[PDB]
Amino acid sequence: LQLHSLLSSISSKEGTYAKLGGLYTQSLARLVTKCEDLFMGGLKTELFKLICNKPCCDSGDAIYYGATCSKDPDSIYAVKICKCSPSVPVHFNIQQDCGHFVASVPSCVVVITREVPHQTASDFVRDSVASHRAEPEVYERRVCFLLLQLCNGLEHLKEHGIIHRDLCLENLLLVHCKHLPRLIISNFLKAKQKPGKSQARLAPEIVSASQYRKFDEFQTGILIYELLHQPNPFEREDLPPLPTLSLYSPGLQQLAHLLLEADPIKRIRIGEAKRVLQCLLWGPRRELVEQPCPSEEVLCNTLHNWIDMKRALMMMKFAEKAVERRRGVELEDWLCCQYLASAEPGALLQSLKLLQLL
Amino acid sequence: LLSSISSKEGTYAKLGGLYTQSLARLVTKCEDLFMGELRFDENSWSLFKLICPCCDSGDAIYYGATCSKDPDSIYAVKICKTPVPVHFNIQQDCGHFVASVPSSMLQEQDCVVVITREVPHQTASDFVRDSVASHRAEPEVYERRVCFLLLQLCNGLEHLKEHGIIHRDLCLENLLLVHCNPHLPRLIISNFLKAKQKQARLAPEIVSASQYRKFDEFQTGILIYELLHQPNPFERREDLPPLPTLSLYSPGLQQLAHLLLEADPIKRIRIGEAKRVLQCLLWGPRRELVEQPCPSEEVLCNTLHNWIDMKRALMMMKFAEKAVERRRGVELEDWLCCQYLASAEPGALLQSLKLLQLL
Amino acid sequence: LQLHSLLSSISSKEGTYAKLGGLYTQSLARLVTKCEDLFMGGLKTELFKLICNKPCCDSGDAIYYGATCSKDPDSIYAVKICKCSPSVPVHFNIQQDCGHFVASVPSCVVVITREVPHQTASDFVRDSVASHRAEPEVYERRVCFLLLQLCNGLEHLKEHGIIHRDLCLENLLLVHCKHLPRLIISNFLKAKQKPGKSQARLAPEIVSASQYRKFDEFQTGILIYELLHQPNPFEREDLPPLPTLSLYSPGLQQLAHLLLEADPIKRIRIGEAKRVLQCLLWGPRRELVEQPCPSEEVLCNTLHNWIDMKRALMMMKFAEKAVERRRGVELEDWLCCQYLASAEPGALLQSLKLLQLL
Amino acid sequence: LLSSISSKEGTYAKLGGLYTQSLARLVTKCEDLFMGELRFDENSWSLFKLICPCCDSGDAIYYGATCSKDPDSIYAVKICKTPVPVHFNIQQDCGHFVASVPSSMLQEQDCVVVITREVPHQTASDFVRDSVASHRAEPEVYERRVCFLLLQLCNGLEHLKEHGIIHRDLCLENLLLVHCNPHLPRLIISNFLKAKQKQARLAPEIVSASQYRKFDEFQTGILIYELLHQPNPFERREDLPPLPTLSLYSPGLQQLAHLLLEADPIKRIRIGEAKRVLQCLLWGPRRELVEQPCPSEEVLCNTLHNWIDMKRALMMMKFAEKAVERRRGVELEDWLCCQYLASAEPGALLQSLKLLQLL
């Protein structure tokens, strides 16, 4: 039983708070897993004319129209008209379809998909010039959540050796899930896969390279500027600063520096970026690191308490959701959960160093 | 906020405080979930129509029926025989009147009819009557159900005391069992026709309660025997018949009956002490924890402190994993369990521990 | 158990057909009882303005309007405006109310009732002059069912010593239950009750009399003519015949003779009339009595088979109703059941004699 | 009509004829009552939504779900694992397709999904598994349920023979139990993946049935042991393990198992003989009637004639008193019982009597 360990040490406050801490971790992991099943849909079938209206999204890859099935006229599908699908399992932030075909050239390869997008990240950046100056903490925060999803998708591609190679804001779909949209990485028209006939008559110094190891990271560094209504500089080190307009402005500038670093061995990996953005989003922050502390060995215990607290608070929040109004589990909650589930004082230290807080 | 995360000792404090702060909000949200402005008299009998006699009670016969005005919800028609704010465990009604009832459903006699949205399918008597097989075949299962029925019985009784009522007719035929799940039933104390409450040409001896202060405790005493398929002993002191030790609860339940059937009202335990002893029988702490080496009862209370903190955290965990399922249903057992962990303090547990004589 | 008796004699065909016969009787009795509970309504409460339209029934006693309760506007009550209620339990064919009061003299004692009538027996006789000549077997049969209900009500009054004393067709309400209506005996404005101070200074030859013993029977004899579009002669023996227009015409004439007999000791009792009408309605008939038979002791066995048959057939009819479309139990079925339940070769003989078939 | 009411002997004739004539109409009306033009494929999966895994089967996992198109009626989603006209006791479906199913409900594997309106809550295995308490506590109740489950099992099997199927994988995990009452469940034979039926580059030995003529009888043989919480004997002739005599049916059931597990297919009894023996175990005639003094089996058949006439008349009576109630519901047990009394003839009963060795 989960309980025998706890009743052995229950005479010790330190002992049972320790075990309570480690089980709060295991439960948050389970909560991540369940959360996924909630958002991924359930069973998915693979598959007449639909259709309804005028474009709902313009992509660097396609144009998207909303479309209706006859055997359920309340069934909503996007019909994606190309102007290729990554050999990879399903992921929340990577595009999926139900099949494809060919059909006419009116006004094509046409692919069907269940996640209909209402705009791209380009369409979003372009429409929010007023809001960014008007309320920049709310905006720059939304930027962090977008970048965090982008990283979550890019990690999964790296786990299967795909390099997207065409990462611009017109290729990032946003799908209702205003409210934090679901970001979906699309347009794999020049994604590469790392093999493993043709020819191995390549130089030794090249078979070592696979020199796209840190190419998607570089592309994301540029998106950080574009999302923040700034130019692509190429058109840390000494790159153009960001205006300090929010609690996130400096951290985002620092992360862009680390991602645009000219030397690929120095440039950070997309996962290193993910944890930084988790840190900008949910902490820790300069205040924790500024209180007098004599060594990194002592900061790690303090970080450990911070984690136990932020986990209990999360647990407490889900516990009150099981017993009120509606379901209420939002995307932002799942993202937070995958932080708290996966964090350890070890890595939080490394991320605070990358932010130049430590 | 989190200023005190630099001290592992101040962090325990806040964590302990989160566990209780939330269990608290939980028991309230569970309250409003169970426990849900509409009434019927003799001119709205037109609204109803029966269905098929679902329960025969100490004071009534209940029939299932429906209104046109409230559809898809199901009511009970309490046809009484002849001769307080709302509580989850105390019968409520949405109207009464007089009807001429065909003799063929108990030619034509007059009876008071009461309509009700808590529809019983069984009294406790019928349950015990029909369970004398399951008792010797699965005692632990059955004897746990008894503890549950007894725990709800105490919730209602201790509510009848907060409002100065003594029921004085607690037999198994008067406690209804109702299906619920907004599988353990809801126990509904009913039949208030011999009750007391605190012109006036009466003596002082009779107007006051006084002698009946602990009558309800005594009958519950008897109710534990009759629930465990044992005869009423009148047909902590011993000389009272033991119960056959058939499960973990059989020693517990037997000690509780002895304390409720004590000769003098002074030594008899209050109904709230019984509620707590049942909470401890049902959820602990148990033998394991209390016979570990201790230099003192104060150390044991500190340990019990940690236990309360640990059960609250597992429970907070239990509901959190419930939030993110496609089911999202709270069971009556959890609500009850929550009202234990929110109200528990280590000095309280220690008293219940030594009534059960695990000390 | 009901079964031990049957398995003792199951080696004997005569023995178990005998016991099957007697239990078919007991079951039909139960079926009578259940039937009553079905038609009598369930619980009845005793008890603002309703009301809706223009008269639905004109009575020798009252005028009736349909009327609606507010706390259920789908609740239909007749409001009976008098132009007195028998101390007697409820009966299907005797009027009931929910209370009464006094109220205004527009265009009164006003009594409320749940069985709203659409016409009286007078209104019925007066409207069916075409039908009686057009299809007289269907008509004269309906007359028998009306008279049978009338007797059923009159018996119940006699069991409690009431003599209605005002039995005309304007006082007999018909209530939907076209289809065989429910006949309801109303207007007790001169009903008498048999006691048992005032004075017992009455002659001996009078305290014996209670000379209304056979007064309601006489009144019914007259209704038999009026229902059959004929005159009241007083405005067996040698009274005006009935036209033979159906299978029932002679029997009804004979029964009217027996009911109008001038000598009260000779006149038959209302129950004697009831069983005659049951006989006109469901048999037996002249054919059974015409087949060669040497003695009344042998006719009684034959009658006994007739009963066992007509009971099984009835049982079989209800058994097929438990398993098809709707409820389907009609008034005509209940009436038939109270015949078959109560009949014995003894009384069927006496009724065939009264019909001059035996 | 009634010409022959002058002879008590011709009246029995017609009465006997009424009893059978009506039981006949009854079993048909019961048929159309149970047993109730709509189908779904991979584009109408949009129509559904799950609820909460109600049953785990030998070949599938079932989940409760609803359509928008058909509301308030409830369907089952049969997620198959990987490696005939309709009958009340044989599984039916309203459509199949392929879906990618989250591993978390058995990341993403492909499975064939079948949707179904007969929603199981339990296999037979789960029932027997969870009933090893009730069996020794109430054997007669439990062993009667077994006979019922076995009787429905034979209805389906004898239907699979009328259409030349042999199931060849009858274990308790493949027989579903379904709630019904348009309390005894509906047993639904499922999982037809190892079945037989009567290019063609195959030998004659394999194309024909031949050797499998009585395989289904043999497994039912085993199924009686496993249902009565007894091990499969392979781990009228004896040497086969007896069953513990715990009820009236235990001797009956034991003799039936011996006859289904006979060594050679010739001496093995057909599944229809087993159906009748179960009908007789369930409803008689019993010991009482057959050991009364008889000068001959012909007299006994005459007696059995009268018995059939007497049970048919009580049954006709049972339904007639049902017509005039406010409930008007037919129970699965009555339908089954009706199909016995309508099909019963005295020579048939006599054979079942002497298989059970009440003769």
Has residue A354 been placed in a domain?
A: no
Whether residues A104 and A172 fall in one domain: no
Residues with Cβ within 8 Å of A335's Cβ and at least 6 positions away in sequence, in order, are A145, A148, A149, A281
Q: How many CB atoms lie within 10 A of CB C211?
A: 9
Whether residues C248 and C168 fall in one domain: yes
Residues with Cβ within 8 Å of D270's Cβ and at least 6 positions away in sequence, in order, are D214, D217
- Whole-angstrom Cα distance, residue A128 to residue A130? 5
CATH assignment of the domain containing A176: 1.10.510.10
H/E stretch holding D101 reads: strand D96-101
Has residue C132 been placed in a domain?
A: yes
Task: Please identify, among C282, C315, C330, the residue that sits at the C-terminal boundary of a domain.
Answer: C282
The neighbouring-strand residues paired with A66 are A78
With H, G, I as helix, E, B as strand and everything else as coil, classify residue D90: strand
Report the sign of the C-alpha dihedral through residues A78, A81, A82, A83, in that order: negative
Closest-approach residue (CA) in chain B for A307: B5
- Decide if B168 contacts B194 (C-beta within 8 A): yes
Write out B222-261 in H/E/C secondary structure.
Answer: HHHHHHCCCCCCCCCCCCCCCCCCCCCHHHHHHHHHHHHC
- Whole-angstrom Cα distance, residue C90 to residue D118? 48
Range of D100's domain? 45-118
- Whole-angstrom Cα distance, residue B131 to residue B145? 11
A192 residue type, one letter:
K
Nearest to B254 by CA among B138, B147, B128: B147
DSSP readout, D163-208? TTEE-----GGGEEEE-----PPEEEE---TT-EE----S-HHHHS
- Whole-angstrom Cα distance, residue D27 to residue D31? 6
Task: Provide the b/e sequence for A144-162 (b: ≥16 CB within 10 Å).
Answer: bbbbbbbbbbbbbbbeeeb
Cβ separation of C43 and B113 shorter than 8 Å? yes
- Whole-angstrom Cα distance, residue A135 to residue A48? 47
H/E stretch holding D50 reads: strand D48-50
Cβ separation of A20 and B310 shorter than 8 Å? yes
* Max CA separation in chain A (angstroms): 77
Strand spans (E) along C62-210: 62-67, 77-82, 100-102, 109-113, 119-120, 162-163, 172-175, 182-185, 192-193
H/E stretch holding D338 reads: helix D332-343
Task: Provide the b/e sequence for B181-217 (b: ≥16 CB within 10 Å).
Answer: eeebbbbbbbbbeeeeeeeeeeeeeeeeeeeeebbbb
Whether residues D69 and D99 fall in one domain: yes
Helix ranges restricted to H, chain A: 4-8, 13-39, 121-127, 129-134, 136-159, 204-207, 215-227, 249-260, 270-282, 286-290, 296-321, 331-342, 345-354
Kindly report the backbone phi and psi dihedral angles of residue C35, in degrees, each rounded to the nearest multiple of 5, phi listed first: -55, -50
Cα B175 → chain centroid: 10
Burial of A203: CB neighbours in 10 Å, binned 0-12, 13-18, 19+: exposed
Nearest to C112 by CA among C83, C76, C86: C76
Has residue B219 been placed in a domain?
A: no
Has residue A38 been placed in a domain?
A: no
Closest Cβ opposite residue D316 in set C17, C34, C315: C315
Whether residues B28 and B66 fall in one domain: no
Tokens 């990194």 belong to A296
Whether residues D138 and D69 fall in one domain: no
Kindly report the backbone phi and psi dihedral angles of residue A242, in degrees, each rounded to the nearest multiple of 5, phi listed first: -100, 145
Task: Please identify, among B101, B119, B137, the residue that sits at the C-terminal boundary of a domain.
Answer: B119
Whether residues B49 and B115 fall in one domain: yes
C211 residue type, one letter:
Q
H/E stretch holding A77 reads: strand A77-82
Q: Residue A127 corresponds to which tokens in the numbers above?
A: 């429409």
Whether residues C243 and C265 fall in one domain: yes
Whether residues A70 and A176 fall in one domain: no
Tokens 């990283």 belong to A151
Whether residues C88 and C155 fall in one domain: no
- Whole-angstrom Cα distance, residue C281 to residue D82? 71
Write out A208-252 in H/E/C secondary structure.
Answer: CCCCCCCHHHHHHHHHHHHHCCCCCCCCCCCCCCCCCCCCCHHHH
Has residue C3 been placed in a domain?
A: no
**How many beta-carbon pairs under 8 angstroms link A with D?**
51
Nearest to D104 by CA among A328, A94, B325: B325
Number of helices (H), then strands (E), in chain C? 13, 11
- D296, D298, D304, D306 alpha-carbon torsion, rounded to 10°: -110
Q: Which residues of C touch B108 (CB under 8 A)?
A: 44, 89-90
Q: How many CB atoms lie within 10 A of CB A215?
A: 16
Q: How was this structure determined?
A: X-ray
Q: Which residues of A touch D108 (CB under 8 A)?
A: 44, 89-90
Chains that touch C (3 or more CB pairs under 8 A): B, D
DSSP B87: B
Q: Which residues of B touch C71 (CB under 8 A)?
A: 43-44, 46-47
H/E stretch holding A45 reads: strand A44-45
Whether residues A224 and A153 fall in one domain: yes
H/E stretch holding D315 reads: helix D297-323
- Decide if C99 contacts C47 (C-beta within 8 A): yes
Whether residues B335 and B312 fall in one domain: yes
Interface-testing mutation among D50, D51, D52, with chain B (most B C-beta atoms within 10 A) = D52
**How many beta-carbon pairs under 8 angstroms link A with B?**
120
- Whole-angstrom Cα distance, residue C19 to residue C1? 14
Chains C and A are touching, with contact defined as 3 or more CB–CB pairs separated by less than 8 Å: no
Has residue A132 been placed in a domain?
A: yes
- Whole-angstrom Cα distance, residue A270 to residue B53? 69
Q: Which residues of D touch B52 (CB under 8 A)?
A: 326-327
Closest-approach residue (CA) in chain B for D141: B133
Tokens 């009626």 belong to D73
With H, G, I as helix, E, B as strand and everything else as coil, classify residue D109: strand
Has residue C130 been placed in a domain?
A: yes
Nearest to D347 by CA among D304, D313, D284: D304
Angle at D327 between CA D323 and CA D330, to 5 degrees: 70
Task: Please identify, among C94, C113, C132, the residue that sits at the C-terminal boundary of a domain.
Answer: C113
Closest Cβ opposite residue C89 in set B45, B105, B108: B108
With H, G, I as helix, E, B as strand and everything else as coil, classify residue D73: coil
- Whole-angstrom Cα distance, residue A33 to residue A313? 19
Q: Residue A326 corresponds to which tokens in the numbers above?
A: 């509606």
Has residue A71 been placed in a domain?
A: yes
Burial of C321: CB neighbours in 10 Å, binned 0-12, 13-18, 19+: buried
- For chain D, how big is the Rg over CA atoms in Å? 23
- Whole-angstrom Cα distance, residue A23 to residue A1? 13
- Decide if C117 contacts C65 (C-beta within 8 A): no
DSSP D87: B
With H, G, I as helix, E, B as strand and everything else as coil, classify residue B90: strand
Cβ separation of B46 and C75 shorter than 8 Å? yes
Q: Which residues of D touch C305 (CB under 8 A)?
A: 5-8, 11
- Decide if A177 contacts A331 (C-beta within 8 A): yes
Resolution of the structure, angstroms: 2.8
| Distance in Å, alpha carbon of B61 to nearest chain C alpha carbon | 13
Whether residues A129 and A181 fall in one domain: yes
Closest Cβ opposite residue B323 in set A13, A308, A321: A321
CATH assignment of the domain containing B114: 3.30.200.20
Burial of C237: CB neighbours in 10 Å, binned 0-12, 13-18, 19+: exposed
- Decide if D301 contacts D344 (C-beta within 8 A): no
* Number of separate domains in chain D: 2
